[PDB]
């Protein structure tokens, strides 16, 4: 059963696929989405995004946006992603918590826009995608995994490069 495509309070289910595994005999991932505005800077005109995959960085959220733009010609000014505390590395800010300056929810993400046209366009478009995937989940646009995980995250045993952390320490002390 999939035809339920509207929740209690404004939530939208966005499903997509998972690729081949060598020992699995329709692996399906959901996102939840609402939207909200305020008078502040970047927490205005922004959609909530719940149940996002491992370390969803810029450029494949941007190929998602780009295939929506090359599919339906939507108005879409999004090129940076906000408030994705993926694993749990940035709950507190110990620097400003013990510092002079640098001052001024769980598993959520914060995807802004700039336009009322963009938020209404992406909102009713992804609602229509939610409905069409609810009655037929068959050949939606899907997750092109030109692997960001094995490049942008495999640094656990890669040593920190010398001139890079030299320049980091030098500019930060300066």
């Amino acid at each position: 059963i999939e035809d339920i495509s509207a929740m209690k309070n404004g939530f939208i289910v966005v499903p997509f696929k998972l690729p081949d595994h060598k020992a699995l005999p329709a692996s399906l991932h959901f996102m939840f989405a609402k939207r909200h505005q305020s008078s502040n800077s970047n927490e205005s005109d922004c959609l909530f995004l719940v149940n996002l995959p491992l370390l969803s960085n810029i450029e494949h959220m941007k190929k998602f946006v780009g295939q929506l733009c090359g599919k339906y010609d939507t108005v879409s000014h999004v090129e940076e992603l906000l408030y994705n505390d993926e694993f749990g590395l940035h709950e507190v800010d110990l620097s400003a918590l013990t510092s002079d300056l640098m001052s001024s929810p769980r598993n959520t993400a914060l995807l802004k826009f700039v336009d009322a046209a963009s938020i209404n366009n992406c909102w009713n478009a992804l609602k229509k995608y939610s409905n069409l995937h609810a009655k037929h989940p068959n050949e939606l646009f899907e997750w092109t995994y030109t692997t960001p995980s094995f490049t942008t995250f495999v640094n656990f045993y890669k040593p920190l490069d010398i001139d890079y952390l030299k320049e980091d320490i030098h500019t930060h002390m300066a």
């Binding site: 289910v13 998972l18 595994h21 699995l24 959901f30 149940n51 491992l54 769980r106 995980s149």
Partner: peptide, 27 residues
């Protein structure tokens, strides 16, 4: 604030997103 990965089937209930989370471990 319940901190899970969800697959709702009805309006109210959600459940563990089991197949996709161990596939994402496998990926």
């Amino acid at each position: 604030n319940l901190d899970c990965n969800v697959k709702p089937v009805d309006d109210e209930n959600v459940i563990l997103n089991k197949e996709a989370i161990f596939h994402e471990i496998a990926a």
